[PDB]
Structures are given as structure tokens and as C-alpha cells.
Amino acid sequence: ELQKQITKIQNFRVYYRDSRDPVWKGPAKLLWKGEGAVVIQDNSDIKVVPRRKAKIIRDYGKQMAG
Amino acid sequence: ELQKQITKIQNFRVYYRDSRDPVWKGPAKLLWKGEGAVVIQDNSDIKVVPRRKAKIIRDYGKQMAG
Amino acid sequence: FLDGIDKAQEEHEKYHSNWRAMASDFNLPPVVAKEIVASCDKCQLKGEAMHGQVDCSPGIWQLDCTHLEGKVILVAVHVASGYIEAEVIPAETGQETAYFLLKLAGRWPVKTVHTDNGSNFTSTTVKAACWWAGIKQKFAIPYNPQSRGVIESMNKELKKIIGQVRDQAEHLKTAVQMAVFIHNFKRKGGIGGYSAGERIVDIIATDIQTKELQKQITKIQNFRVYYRKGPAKLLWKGEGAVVIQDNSDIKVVPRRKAKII
Amino acid sequence: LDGIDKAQEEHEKYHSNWRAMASDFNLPPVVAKEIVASSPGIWQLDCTHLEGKVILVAVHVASGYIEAEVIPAETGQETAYFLLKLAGRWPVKTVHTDNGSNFTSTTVKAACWWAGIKQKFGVIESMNKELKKIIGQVRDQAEHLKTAVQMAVFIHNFKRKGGIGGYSAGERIVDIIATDIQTKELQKQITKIQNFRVYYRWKGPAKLLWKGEGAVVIQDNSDIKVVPRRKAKIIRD
Amino acid sequence: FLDGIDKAQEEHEKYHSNWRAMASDFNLPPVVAKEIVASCDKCQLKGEAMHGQVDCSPGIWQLDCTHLEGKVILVAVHVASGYIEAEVIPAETGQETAYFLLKLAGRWPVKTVHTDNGSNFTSTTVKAACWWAGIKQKFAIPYNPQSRGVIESMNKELKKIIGQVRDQAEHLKTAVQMAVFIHNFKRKGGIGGYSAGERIVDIIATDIQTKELQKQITKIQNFRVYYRKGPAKLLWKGEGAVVIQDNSDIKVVPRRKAKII
Amino acid sequence: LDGIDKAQEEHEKYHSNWRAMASDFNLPPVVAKEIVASSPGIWQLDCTHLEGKVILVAVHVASGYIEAEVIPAETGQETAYFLLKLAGRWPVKTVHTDNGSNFTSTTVKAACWWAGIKQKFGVIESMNKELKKIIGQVRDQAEHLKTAVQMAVFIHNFKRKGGIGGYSAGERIVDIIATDIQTKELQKQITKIQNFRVYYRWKGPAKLLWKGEGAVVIQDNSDIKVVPRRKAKIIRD
Amino acid sequence: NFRVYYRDSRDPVWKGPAKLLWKGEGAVVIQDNSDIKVVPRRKAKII
Amino acid sequence: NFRVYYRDSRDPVWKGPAKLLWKGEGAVVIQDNSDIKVVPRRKAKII
DNA sequence: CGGGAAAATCTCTAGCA
DNA sequence: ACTGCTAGAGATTTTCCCG
DNA sequence: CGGGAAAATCTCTAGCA
DNA sequence: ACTGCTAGAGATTTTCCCG
Ligand SMILES: C[C@@H]1CCO[C@H]2Cn3cc(C(=O)NCc4ccc(F)cc4F)c(=O)c(O)c3C(=O)N12
Ligand SMILES: C[C@@H]1CCO[C@H]2Cn3cc(C(=O)NCc4ccc(F)cc4F)c(=O)c(O)c3C(=O)N12
Ligand SMILES: [Mg+2]
Ligand SMILES: [Mg+2]
Ligand SMILES: [Mg+2]
Ligand SMILES: [Mg+2]
Ligand SMILES: [Zn+2]
Ligand SMILES: [Zn+2]
């Protein structure tokens, strides 16, 4: 049910940048996806990233690797 | 005598760069000045720097400040 | 510093010495010397040393024209993935651009296009094409190519590949399509080690899937959260922190001093 | 790791595939592929005619997604260029043509050789009918037939929701290609691991299935046995 | 990988896929995929991402010409200090350059000049001027301005100052000399917070003083040092390390396993 | 810190200056300046004549270092441009001219006002004689008199070693200007510190001389007393 | 308020002072003599 | 030995392979078809 | 030992054309 | 065998001042 | 726990014209 | 109210493999 859905959302990865660092910050965990912002979880930490700074993939290689 | 001369040499400062870092490394201590190289002493450490990478000043502001 | 300040402004009107030279030569604290510099219109000659960041939402495409061997190559890139669409067009005109764009909108989901201010892109016919397809147009600041940085870099990459495979074709149009193939499917890197084709598939598939998933979650998970305020809708809870939305302002407040109803 | 037996029992009862067995019971997909083990690149081409012009139409058969455009003439070169464009835009493994002169020329064949497309000489007809219907609905919103053709392609790919899950052809083709990428990645993982030989506790040669961070899954005598990493010695044969 | 290697070279001849795409699509270790890339002449299109470092010895001067309002400004910079010498010259000719250079050699110690390959600098008359003054000429790699980076940056700085003080003069020659004044004495920064004039004075004074000092030290301090070898002349000793010179090779060996005689 | 009394005794015996007292006895130079306390920017200009041309010659009087060149004509503008060049190349505080028309023009005065040079209307003559002697020695190595003038300037500044320490005019001028920079820096330090007032152990107002890292030097009742930093309270008056 | 000095639109000469209307990341909107301009922050200085 | 590929002297086309003769910091000396060239290391690739 | 405020240091950009 | 740099704007980190 | 070797990551450049 | 980026070459750091 709702737990399965939430874990599914949490399988997706988020690459993101901060407002002054041009390096794309490595794969984080997707907690919530909105119209204007996504809420991620990067190394025991909950950031709010705007949508225009966020690349959300599933990464099929890692999904198939388990 | 020789001790006074050596301390005098050691009053001079050396700005220098390493072969792959473009930042000029901060004020070091001049131990020896040769034709092809100068021997410096930067933070309890003895490096040999080529002359073309070494700016040697006395820095009159600091000399006057003591 | 009253005496020193008057001498330093007199001297700055002639020489425009920087703040250090004034602070040194007239006994002034750095803040006063810097103020004398900052009051001179003639010394405001340098911008702040940063770079902005272009929009990378799933629906943004950056368009540009480029030129090779006398022909005009119209290039689009999907910003999120690096996936390119390019065609040799007969001229740099709004008619060919509107056609390229309407094709692109029929091929992939396009929400926004981002171009420089070339006449082909600001044409009324391109505007009518965007209005029919539902595409929002965004025009960069004039003469700031850094704003189109993604597509300009894709220009460089596409020309490099065309130069690698030019001898395998006759007409430039064929070599361009070959290079588009090579970029989209035969070069892997970036975030998920993907090719651009794989990556765009993943980006768009993820967009659709997450949209549906969160639709179902919000449809099920309905609660209200108080913290410190009012009935702030709940987004996510877990690991000692709660994510909530109070008047379109998403804030992460810890579990303590936050109750869910 | 512990739900492997549950997965085997589920496959014996219901014959579920590896996707459900790996998503419900939490298994590295190579494990589910072993349990179960113990199109997306096919396009249909065809030229069609309208207002005296030729409309070359490509159909991804698995999704119903269309790539159509007006070409100047029905020659080999035009078809081959359309094919290079299609292949550079999508994963194209196989094309289904109708023995027409353009579809058999030396240039189209050379382009399929360059792109690595296989050529093999009903859905195309019905899709052409749908395309001509939309082209008729929107011919008045445009002056040239090429613009109307692209408008119709847009309407068909993103504005016509049908099928079971109420999706457009674009959503469907994206889903199908994503599935195919998953398939290719799983096959690469299997091909990687299939060259290893394992010896555990020391028993006979066993087949490696996964080298997790806390366990090692193998398969001996058609039996999937989980063992620690220190208790097993992986080699390469 | 015998089967995989043959398929990957066949595919690379068509597409020129990078090493990752091959490693992924044909089961190859990264080293073999990278070798296939590194064997293709057609894929060698990028240099190593570094920058060299220009010579900054006390005697090096970097010369260049620059252009403003239709006139030719000949600019020299002392590399160690940032001190500039600039004059408006009537044309970009070897005769005016030789004259500027001979003046400079009479004003300051010049050992080496470093220029691009403009015709004024490679002229025979400039060569005769350098030979009379004892100046060694060094010519950068053609069309590599980064080699003249110091003087090119000084061009930018001098033009910026000229633009700040242009309205205080009539002829460009006067504004150029004003800007040279402003750069040499009214702008402080760099290593010792100096101006360029102060800094060049310090650099040259230090050169002379250290030369004499070490002359006297080596004249007094005469010893021989063995370590591990032969009679290596002694340079400096102290703080548990000894500095020595064994066959023109200066090495810092610790006090242990090093004896002075 | 402990050699301050030694410095006072040395100044009483020998009247040494602050340089020796600060280098031999190790004192922040403001301390030695207090003990002792209890030209380098002057240039001579003059136009000279040769082969019908005018040679404008500047002499740094303290060192004997020459800046000479052929000018087209003896006008104010030419002299003023020579002066702007000289001032942008060296620290020029004062120029000593000979009331000639060029040396008194409104343009030369405006240039000295812009550069911050003071104008005041034997060494110049002797130096001109030396310059003409070298110009004669090297007139044959050149075609134009301007090249020979610059050759002679080079020979005079770097190839003629004389004086006590066997130096050239260039070495001398560099030494003198370095000394002057030291002087300016010491004066800036003194001006900085002269605005502070100190109270130590709490005694009366004392004058600050140095705020070292381990001690604080002050001067009370014409007596230089060293105290710790915690034992004193610096303020600003 | 704020003084804005800027270099716009290929003219390498720096203009201003202008009034700041909006400050984003990467760009500002300035008001210089009734003209609204949009300038990258690389090409402006806000005082 | 070494293969050297280089871009020289304003020609944006990459040439080579050439033989490496000398390797400094910042530059190399190559030998391409009897021609000695001097190239910045930003503009070469040594294999 | 503690913050605050000021200095020092570090990061990063355009223009040199 | 030769070689990017310089100075300023803003951010971040270290140092000094009085408790 | 220890090195070695291989992978991953980080740093940094030109060209986009 | 908008905004540098991308991919490759080489260097450095982390991870995995068998003892
Ligand atoms: C007439 C249209 C509209 C108005 O402006 C002009 C001129 N222009 C100039 C460049 C250019 O200078 N590229 C080099 C570059 C420099 C920095 C960077 F970050 C990215 C870069 F690509 C273009 O690429 C380009 O497309 C145009 C163009 O189209 N137009
Ligand atoms: C005919 C002579 C000899 C042969 O080459 C040409 C052409 N050239 C071109 C530039 C130039 O492109 N500057 C921009 C730049 C770019 C990068 C960088 F690191 C430094 C920079 F200054 C010059 O400055 C220059 O003096 C010349 C010149 O003199 N010549
Ligand atoms: Mg453009
Ligand atoms: Mg462009
Ligand atoms: Mg030049
Ligand atoms: Mg130049
Ligand atoms: Zn100013
Ligand atoms: Zn290749």
C-alpha cells in the first residue's frame, strides 16, 4: 500500500546542485516530488532543492545490479 | 661574523610556486641562494626551488614592523 | 582621519589609487579607503566572480543554430539528459525553425525552449508554432552565450563528432545525422554512466512514474501537521524529521515540536 | 536473502515473472532471473500519399508511436536519410518495409548497415488511416502539408490517450524503451557474472549469482544457496 | 574478450564510441576499451588540462605591443615585480623597438626579454640592440599568448587605467605615461602589499644584497660533507637537516648519515 | 627586549643611529627610533646640446644615476613629457631646473602638479661632461645621436663602477631608494602608533612604542619600559 | 537602496549608476534612465 | 617510446602521430615528418 | 575561555584580442 | 629545447579585543 | 589488518565563435 | 523578471582482493 509507494519513490535518485556550486552533488534519495521543489535526503540530511536544479533518474544499471 | 651573515640571509623571504600549482606559496625563509636554485625553509621543511619559480623580497613593511 | 580623508579623495580624483594604496599612504582604516574607492563611478569596472546556473527541468530544450562548411545546422539539446536533435536547414529563417520545433514537440515532450535572440528564434512564425504546441519561450539576456551554455557546448561536441565521421559520408546532412546518432547512443558518461538516449528515456520515464506515484501517495496519505503554527499539509515523515508545506513554503522541521493529525 | 524460498514457492504456485519476484520479495534481479530460468526495437516503415505528396511514416509497433514527414520524392536517398534520422533519435534494431524500390535500394541498405539496423521485407495501414484522419482534422490550421503532417504526428503521439492505462503513444514508447534498457542492463550483469566459478565451505564448482556486501548467492545442483563471503572463494574460468 | 575485442574495433571504426560505451556494450575491462580508443588517430583531439608557468627570474622582461585609438603602445613588464614601462611609438617597427629596448636596458638591469613573434621583435635591429646590451632574447611558441601571459595581462591593466584617466589629458602619449605612473606607484597589492615600483626596488636590491652576502658566506664557510658518497660541498646546515651540492645536484639529506669535514 | 639598556648605553657612548641599534641589539625599529630620538627624491634637470640636437638630462643627485634622451625641440611640452616619464619610472619628489623657458612653462608646471613634483629654480654640469665623454666614445657604434645617447646612458649607469664601494649608479640608486622605502614604512608605523595612550600596572598615560607578541614596549617620563600585555591597557586618544 | 554599475550588451564600457529592481541568482534587473535592462551578475556590481 | 598528437599554430585541426624529443613542464618538442615543432602541453597528447 | 568585529585568506572571473 | 596571468569582488577563515 | 591494483573521484581545460 | 557547460586527460583517493 502506501508503504510500497513511499519505498518506490525512495528508489529514485536525485542529482542536484546548490545555488553557488557548479558541481552536481552525487546521488541522493528522493523523498518528495513537487511542482516547484523536490525534497531529497543526502547523507543523513534532508535538503529542499528547486526543480530546476534537480536531475531525477532511476539508474537502471544500479537497479539491475541490486 | 659568519653567523651574522647567515641570519641576514635568513631575514629574506621567498615566494615560490610548485611545478603544478599556480598559487604562489606564502612567505618562506631563505636558506641559500644559488645561480640555478634557492633553498628555502617553509613551515619546518626544507624545499629546493628553481630560481625561475622564486620571488625573493625583504618586505620593508614587515622589517620596519619588527 | 579628517585630514587624511580629504587628502585621499584629492589624490583619488587624479590617480584612482586602489583602497590599499590610500590606506597605506594616508593612514586610513581599510573601510574608509574602500569607501573612497566605492564612491568613484570611474572605478566601478569589474563584475562579481561567479557563474549562474541554467534551468535543467525535464521539459527545457535549448536551441541554437551553428555553421559548418557554409550550411546552417539547427541544434536542440534536452538540458536534463544531453540528448540532441540536429538538422541541416537550407537557411537561418523562422519558417524552418518553426518546422524543426513543431517536429520536436511532436517527437518528445517539450515544455520550454531557451534560445539566444537570433531573428529565426524571435520570429512571429516560431511564436505561433510554440503557441500551438504549448511551448513556452525563454530568451536569454542578449549577447550572453553563457546563458545558452548547454547548447553551445553541444555545438562544440557535435562539430567534433562530425569532424570524426565526415569522411564516411558525402553530404553534410548525412554526416550530421550520423553524428547525432553517435552522440545519442555511442558515447556513455554523465550521471548514470548512460548514453544521452538512455538518459533521456530514464529522465522522462522517471518524471511520469514519480508524478503518478506521488499522486497516489497524496491521495492516500492525508494528514495535517502542527509545529511550533497552523494546519500545515504533510509531505514526508521519517528518521526524526518531518517535511511539511506551510503556505507554499516547504520547511524541514524535526520530529520534536511537530505533531501530525 | 531470506525470501528466496518464498520466491521459489511463488514461482511454483503462480509462475510469476522475475519483475514481481524481485520487487515484492526483495531480490537482486539476477537471483529472480535464476529462479524463473530454472520487439521494442522493431519499426514498420511505409510511404503513403496525400495531396500529391508522399508521406513517409514509421511506426514503433509495440507502442503505436509515429514518426512521419513529407519527403520531396520516393527515392532511396530520401528513405535512407529518414532512416538515419530515426535511428539517431531512437533505438532501432529492425525495420519492416514493403519491398518497394526505395525500401530496397543500395543506399537504404548501406544506411541500415551503418546504423546496425536489420531489414525484413496490417498495423501500418490502420495507423496510416488514423494519421490521415488527424491530417484532415488539422489541414485547415496550416498552409503547407508538411506542417499539417507534423501537427497530426503531435496530436497522435501526445493528444490521443487510449489503450488500457489511458496513455499516449509517447508515454507508452518511453515505458517500453525504459523496460528494454532494464533488460539490456540485466543481460550485461548476467554476462559479467556467468564467467565466474565458486567453491564454498570445499564443495564442487558452483555458479555465481550475486556478490553482495553481506552475502554471496550461488547456484549448485539447481539449488540457490546463500553463503558468507569468507566461506567462499570466487575465481574466474 | 577475444570476441568482444573484435566487435568493438569494428564498431569503433564506424562510430568512434568512447571507452565507456565499448566497455558497456561489449563486456570489456576499462583498460582494453581505453586501449581501443588510444589506438585510433581520429580520437586524439584533446590536450592535457594544465597550465605551465612562466619564468619569473629577477632579470626577465616580457615585451609586447598593444593598440589604442589607432596608435601602437609598446609595453614592457618586469615579471618579478609587475613594474611596467610603456611608450606610444609611431609605428610597430624594429627600429623603434630597438630604441625602446636599449633605453630600458640603460634604465634597469635587463638580462632576458620574452616576446611573441611579431616582426618588430624578431627584427635584426632588435637583435643587434640585444647583443650590444647583453640581453638574451626568448621567443614564445608561435600563437600561444599564454606564454606572454604576464605582459598580456599588463596590457589589459594599462588599458583599464588609460580609460580611467583619458579625460585628464589630450594626447594619448600623455595619458599612457600617466597610466604608467598610476600602475607603478598608486596601486598596491601583490606579495608584499607593495606598489610595482616599491616591489621592483625590493627585488633588485635583494638580488644584489643576497649575491654579496652568499659570496661572503661561501668565502668563509668552507667545508666538505659526506653522506651515505663523495666530498659534497656544504651549502647550509641546521634544524636536523643539511643542504649539500653533489655534482650540481642539490639534495636535502638529514643530519643522520651526513658528516661535515 | 633585554638589549634596550645596551642600546641606550651604546647611544650614550657612540651616538650610533637607529639602524645599527636595531640590527645589532635586536629591536623593533620603532624602539631604536625612540632611543635615538630622545634627498633620495631630488632630481636635477638640464638641457644640453650636441650635433645640433638638444639632450635633456635628468640626474638623481644622491646616486649619480642618469636619465637622458634626445628631444625634438626645447619646448615646455617636451620637457613636461620627459618629466611625466621620469616620475612614472622613479619616485620623484623634487626637480632642480635652471629657470630656462622650457623649465618654467605652464605645461611643465601642470605636469609637476599632476605628478606631485616640487619645482625649485654644479653636479649637473660635471655629469653632462661625463655624458658627452661617453657619447664621444660610442658615437661611432651608432648612426643616430639618440641611439648613442642611450648607449652612453647605459654605460654610465651600469658599466662605470666607482665611488667607495665600487658600485654603479644603478646599484647605488636602487640601494638609496630601498633605504627611502624603509624610511617611509618606519614613518607610517610611527604615525600609526603615535595616536595610542597606555596605562600599565594604574600609572599615568604612557606612549606606545610596540605591541609585540610577548611584550609591550612603552615610554614614560623619557624612560623606555617593557611590560606584559595583560599588565597594560591600550586605548586610543 | 543600491547603486548598480554594469556592462551590457557587447559594449565593453561600464555604465551606471542604475537602480536595482530585482536580484536573482545569476542576473539582475536594473533601471537606468527609465530603461529596464537585464544583466548577468558577472556583468554588474551592486553597491 | 611515445606517440604525440598535437594541435599547432592556430590550425584547430589535430595532427600526428609524431615522435617526442623533449618533455618539459608546459611544452614538448616533437618531430613530425622531419619537422621539429615546439608545442604547449595544453595542445598535445602524449601516449 | 567566548563572541564580535576586523583582518587575512581563499575562490574565481574577464580581458589581454 | 618551454611554460597564463593580474587584480578586484565576494565568501570564508583566522586573529585580536576586551571582558 | 596490509599492500597492490583497479575503480571512483576529483581537477581542470578548450571550444562553443 | 535569469543564470556556463561538456567531455576527456591526468592526478588523487577509495574500494576490493587475497592473503
Ligand atoms: C545573431 C545571434 C543572436 C545575438 O548574438 C549573435 C552572436 N553569437 C555569438 C556566439 C558565441 O560567441 N559563442 C562563443 C561562446 C562564448 C562563451 C560561451 F559561454 C559560449 C559560447 F558559445 C554564439 O554562439 C551565437 O549562437 C551567436 C548568435 O547566434 N547570435
Ligand atoms: C603578429 C603578432 C605575432 C603572432 O600572433 C599575432 C597575433 N596576436 C594575438 C594576441 C591575443 O590573442 N590576445 C588575447 C589573449 C588570449 C589568451 C591569453 F592567454 C592572452 C591573451 F592576450 C595578442 O595578444 C598579440 O600580442 C598578437 C600578436 O602580436 N601577434
Ligand atoms: Mg546562436
Ligand atoms: Mg551559439
Ligand atoms: Mg603581440
Ligand atoms: Mg599581446
Ligand atoms: Zn576612482
Ligand atoms: Zn576513434
Author numbering:
A (entry chain C), B (entry chain I): 212 to 277
C (entry chain A), E (entry chain G): 1 to 228, 236 to 268
D (entry chain B), F (entry chain H): 2 to 39, 57 to 139, 149 to 228, 235 to 270
G (entry chain D), H (entry chain J): 222 to 268
Sentences from the paper on this structure:
HIV-1 and other retroviruses integrate a DNA copy of their viral RNA genome into the genome of the host cell, a process that is mediated by the virally encoded enzyme integrase (IN). INSTIs work by chelating the two Mg2+ ions, blocking the active site and inhibiting the strand transfer activity of IN.
Here, we determined structures of the HIV-1 intasomes E138K/G140A/Q148R and E138K/G140S/Q148H, with DTG bound, resolved to 2.5 and 2.2 Å, respectively. Although Arg is further from the Mg2+ ions, it is a stronger proton donor, and thus, the Arg would also be expected to have a significant effect on the polarization around the Mg2+ ions, weakening the chelation by the bound drug. We do not observe loss of potency of DTG against G140A/Q148R intasomes, which implies that the Arg is slightly reoriented in the double mutant in comparison to the triple mutant. Although 4d did lose potency against E138K/G140A/Q148R (41.5 ± 5.2 nM; FC = 28), it retained more potency than DTG (P value < 0.001).
